[PDB]
Amino acid sequence: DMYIERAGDITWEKDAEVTGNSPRLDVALDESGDFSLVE
Amino acid sequence: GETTDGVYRVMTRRLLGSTQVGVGVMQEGVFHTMWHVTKGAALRSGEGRLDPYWGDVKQDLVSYCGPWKLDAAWDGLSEVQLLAVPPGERAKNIQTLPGIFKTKDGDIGAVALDYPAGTSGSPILDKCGRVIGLYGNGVVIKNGSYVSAITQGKRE
Numbered sequence A: 001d002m003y004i005e006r007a008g009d010i011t012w013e014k015d016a017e018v019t020g021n022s023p024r025l026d027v028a029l030d031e032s033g034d035f036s037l038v039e
Numbered sequence B: 001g002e003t004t005d006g007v008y009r010v011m012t013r014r015l016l017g018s019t020q021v022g023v024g025v026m027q028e029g030v031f032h033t034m035w036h037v038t039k040g041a042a043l044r045s046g047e048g049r050l051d052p053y054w055g056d057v058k059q060d061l062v063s064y065c066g067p068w069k070l071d072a073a074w075d076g077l078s079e080v081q082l083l084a085v086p087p088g089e090r091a092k093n094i095q096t097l098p099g100i101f102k103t104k105d106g107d108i109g110a111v112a113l114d115y116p117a118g119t120s121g122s123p124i125l126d127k128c129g130r131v132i133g134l135y136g137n138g139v140v141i142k143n144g145s146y147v148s149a150i151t152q153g154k155r156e
């Protein structure tokens, strides 16, 4: 059986660590909810 | 059980020890997570029981105790924060500028951050702290990096 446990408040935090890039990707979404890369 | 607004871990005792299978958001008495985390199954919150109310495998979303409540949207311009809740680790805000998933049905924001699979369902926030979507349904790109869609449901 599955259970939930609280992990925190939902807030924007000033001075959070900034990382990750911003790619533009052509994708497809199938009937099963899976995304795939289209080229 | 616990109905306080906030971010929650989704756990199971079926495998070895206690295992985190995903994450979710409690807002206005409704629990919001990704479909692939629970497969639509009932959830426990202490001694209380959360039953599925709405779900869709194609959107990869599910709500418990009521209809989907999250309706904020990425503005297509500003940086956002992934409120990451990794297995066995503390909740941690990570700021990033989203990329784009271009599809035949329109464009969707995407966050290029890599976390273990049990982090699926962690909320993505705007500058006012509003949940603009959930992290955890995406693609593995050419370099092995994970890129998730900013997945948002519709509020009726």
Ligand SMILES: COc1ccnc(N2CCNCC2)n1
Binding pocket: B114, B115, B116, B117, B118, B119, B120, B135, B136, B137, B138, B140, B146
């Ligand atoms: C947190 O969301 C998800 C969902 C599915 N797979 C993943 N991976 C892909 C491979 N392992 C690292 C990240 N993350």
